[PDB]
């Protein structure tokens, strides 16, 4: 087991680009910075690699825009229920890709 635990407690900017603030615990504490579309690479890339695991599904990515900050202040909460059951799952429980995400800045 490698059961760090997060929030995802607010969506903020680097002033351009927003990201969500994901706030890694585990007493070690800290915050990562991620963008809407890492989201989708990781699972990309997470899925492709463990077993046959659904439980934390990403809503399909919309297109239309404006990509902007309400948009993802409205994604939020799914999205810290996503990496949140990610750290659940077993199989999960070592993989790189998964730190790397939840690795500072």
């Known amino acids: 087991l490698a059961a760090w635990k997060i929030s995802i407690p607010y969506v903020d900017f680097f002033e351009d680009i927003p990201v969500f603030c994901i706030d890694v615990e585990r007493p070690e504490h800290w915050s990562v910075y991620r963008r809407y579309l890492e989201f989708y690479v990781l699972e990309s890339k997470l899925t492709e690699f463990h077993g046959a695991f659904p439980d934390a599904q990403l809503p399909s ?14 994604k939020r909460e799914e999205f810290q229920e996503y990496l949140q059951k990610l750290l659940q799952h077993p199989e999960l429980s070592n993989s790189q890709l998964l730190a790397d995400f939840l690795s500072p800045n």
């Open 61 to 74: 990515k919309r297109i239309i825009g404006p990509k902007n900050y309400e948009f993802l202040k409205s």
